[PDB]
Design an enzyme around this catalytic site. Sequence first.
Site, PDB file in Angstrom:
ATOM      1  N   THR B 155       0.782  -1.242   0.000  1.00 33.65           N
ATOM      2  CA  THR B 155       0.000   0.000   0.000  1.00 33.65           C
ATOM      3  C   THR B 155       0.810   1.286   0.000  1.00 33.65           C
ATOM      4  OG1 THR B 155      -1.830  -1.105   1.012  1.00 33.65           O
ATOM      5  CG2 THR B 155      -1.993   1.254   0.927  1.00 33.65           C
ATOM      6  N   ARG B 183     -10.623 -10.643  -3.294  1.00 37.74           N
ATOM      7  CA  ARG B 183     -10.713 -10.030  -2.022  1.00 37.74           C
ATOM      8  C   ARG B 183     -10.442  -8.544  -2.252  1.00 37.74           C
ATOM      9  NH1 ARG B 183      -6.873  -6.674   0.830  1.00 37.74           N
ATOM     10  NH2 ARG B 183      -7.225  -6.823   3.068  1.00 37.74           N
ATOM     11  N   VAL B 184     -11.221  -7.726  -1.541  1.00 29.42           N
ATOM     12  CA  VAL B 184     -11.134  -6.276  -1.604  1.00 29.42           C
ATOM     13  C   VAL B 184     -10.841  -5.797  -0.211  1.00 29.42           C
ATOM     14  CG1 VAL B 184     -12.288  -4.168  -2.255  1.00 29.42           C
ATOM     15  CG2 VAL B 184     -12.911  -6.282  -3.328  1.00 29.42           C
ATOM     16  N   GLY B 185      -9.846  -4.926  -0.072  1.00 30.91           N
ATOM     17  CA  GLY B 185      -9.493  -4.355   1.213  1.00 30.91           C
ATOM     18  C   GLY B 185     -10.094  -2.986   1.385  1.00 30.91           C
ATOM     19  N   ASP B 186      -9.535  -2.207   2.296  1.00 32.66           N
ATOM     20  CA  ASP B 186     -10.005  -0.848   2.547  1.00 32.66           C
ATOM     21  C   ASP B 186      -9.649   0.164   1.491  1.00 32.66           C
ATOM     22  OD1 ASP B 186      -7.230  -1.283   3.443  1.00 32.66           O
ATOM     23  OD2 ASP B 186      -7.336   0.871   3.920  1.00 32.66           O
ATOM     24  N   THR B 206      -2.963   2.784   5.706  1.00 34.70           N
ATOM     25  CA  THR B 206      -2.278   1.558   5.332  1.00 34.70           C
ATOM     26  C   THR B 206      -2.417   0.551   6.471  1.00 34.70           C
ATOM     27  OG1 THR B 206      -0.178   0.704   4.486  1.00 34.70           O
ATOM     28  CG2 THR B 206      -0.035   2.188   6.313  1.00 34.70           C
ATOM     29  N   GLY B 207      -2.206  -0.730   6.175  1.00 33.76           N
ATOM     30  CA  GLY B 207      -2.291  -1.798   7.200  1.00 33.76           C
ATOM     31  C   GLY B 207      -3.289  -2.915   6.906  1.00 33.76           C
ATOM     32  N   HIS B 208      -3.826  -3.526   7.955  1.00 34.19           N
ATOM     33  CA  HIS B 208      -4.744  -4.673   7.769  1.00 34.19           C
ATOM     34  C   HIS B 208      -6.143  -4.202   7.331  1.00 34.19           C
ATOM     35  CE1 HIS B 208      -6.946  -8.490   9.018  1.00 34.19           C
ATOM     36  NE2 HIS B 208      -6.125  -8.837   8.047  1.00 34.19           N
ATOM     37  N   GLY B 209      -6.440  -4.412   6.064  1.00 31.92           N
ATOM     38  CA  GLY B 209      -7.563  -3.735   5.439  1.00 31.92           C
ATOM     39  C   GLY B 209      -8.895  -4.028   6.068  1.00 31.92           C
TER      40      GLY B 209
HETATM   41 NA    NA Z   1      -5.041   1.237   2.721  1.00 34.90          NA
END
Ligand code: NA
EC number: 3.4.19.5
Lengths: 296, 296
Positions: B155, B183-186, B206-209
Amino acid sequence: GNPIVVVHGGGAGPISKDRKERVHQGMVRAATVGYGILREGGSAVDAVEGAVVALEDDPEFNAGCGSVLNTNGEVEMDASIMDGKDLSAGAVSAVQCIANPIKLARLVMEKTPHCFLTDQGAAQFAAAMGVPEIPGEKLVTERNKKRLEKEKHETVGAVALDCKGNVAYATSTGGIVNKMVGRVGDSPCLGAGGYADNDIGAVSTTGHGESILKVNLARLTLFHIEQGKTVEEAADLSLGYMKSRVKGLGGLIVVSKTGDWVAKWTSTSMPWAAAKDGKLHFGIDPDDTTITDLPG
Amino acid sequence: GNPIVVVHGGGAGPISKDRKERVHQGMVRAATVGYGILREGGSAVDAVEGAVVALEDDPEFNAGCGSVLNTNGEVEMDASIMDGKDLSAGAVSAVQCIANPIKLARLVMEKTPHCFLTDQGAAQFAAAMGVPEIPGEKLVTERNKKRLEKEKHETVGAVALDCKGNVAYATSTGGIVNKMVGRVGDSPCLGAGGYADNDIGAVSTTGHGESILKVNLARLTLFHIEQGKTVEEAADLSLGYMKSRVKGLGGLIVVSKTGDWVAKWTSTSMPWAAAKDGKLHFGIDPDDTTITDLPG
Ligand code: NA
Ligand code: NA
Ligand code: NA
């Protein structure tokens, strides 16, 4: 102590008075499921899912069967569901050829380490979980074909508070008429199509998804409540902001963690219902709120 | 007023000291672009887009070339960009075989009435806008192949405030290692992967979505600022809540509408930089921070 469920069937223009009856039945049916789950001591998450499965299946509502059509006359669906205890969640965007998106969203919550799957990945996951594929024409109705053509030539949800004080929301949709292929609205996006947190409340939204996303409508409603506003005030301020700031209409249902609830909207109508303390509240326009005593 | 850009290159474990140098250059390069756009009187939106294009192209960062691999050893990318003046926005999820997702996200913002496209619809829209297809093996690096095998056997972003007082954010990613297909993150979800509003500020995360989505990290940071917190406090509270409530680590960069900014994180490191008043700030570990006088 006193569980509640509220359900909504999506904003609309004014509604044909014959069509209003079928919509009323749809709503009542969904509240009856939601409330019956809560009355046996089931969870807020199963309650919102059950109500939403009913509205998906009912072809008067833009979700599942009866979803609006995209620009190619096809059905593409978004959904999400969230548990307020630990904030866990599941969502799918742009799914095709399945009866119940909200149930695929629950499977993402329960059976994967992720909260959100889209399109091909979502279809693959569905297949691997044994979800049956239905042909897309099954979800297309005549009313929606004519709605597409009219638009070229020129959502459902639920929240609940359960016997243990847990809240939850669920939202499912076919989108907006004539959307581009692969367009994704607010409905699968946490904080936009809904939000659920036991320390505040739960919200499910409806309306112009682009606006809803840009204002984070669900979460914004809950912020106002954290700041000491009532649910009625919170909903009026959030929906007013969406109207003035980005020219977007919609609505929502909310339930706080103390059991206060409301349904508000800036479109002409939004079919809603709520069941609490043995009473069923129902409405479509801001005129016609009925309260019916249920057994209990 | 006087313009600021802040950029981040994603959280990480500790970084190999040879690799740190290449990362440093990457970050400096991206700030230089962002800051050079602002200094000629360009917009916050073009500033965040240009910084992020540079980090997408740089293979030391998990976005574009150098994106982490999904479970099938393929690159799938998310991005979003948002203008704080009228809240307009563009995003893409699960795109493949293009060099610069953030540029496709800008095209969704500029050329469609929607804010978000996914997968096949996004690929089609790209083709129709003449975006060239590049082969997927071009985005895969050796480091990421070995990162995938290690995980199986077991990210980037920017914000800015421009000469006219407009803010914006941009965020782009390849995801998390070994994520499921689709899979879709934040990162493409407004209020989670970032948020921008001229009445408050802008944030990229940034990080664990999954965690970021559940807490609405970007928008939450801004709430704390609306409540009178400093940017430093806001970031510490919002990242602390993510840590305690859902056991999620990450970081963010924030800029308020008055020009205060900060970079914070809960992972080991987060490559960041900021340019303002002719100074370039840079860091990777929370311990040390370099300030370089620029000519400006
Ligand atoms: Na992000
Ligand atoms: Na339906
Ligand atoms: Na890169």
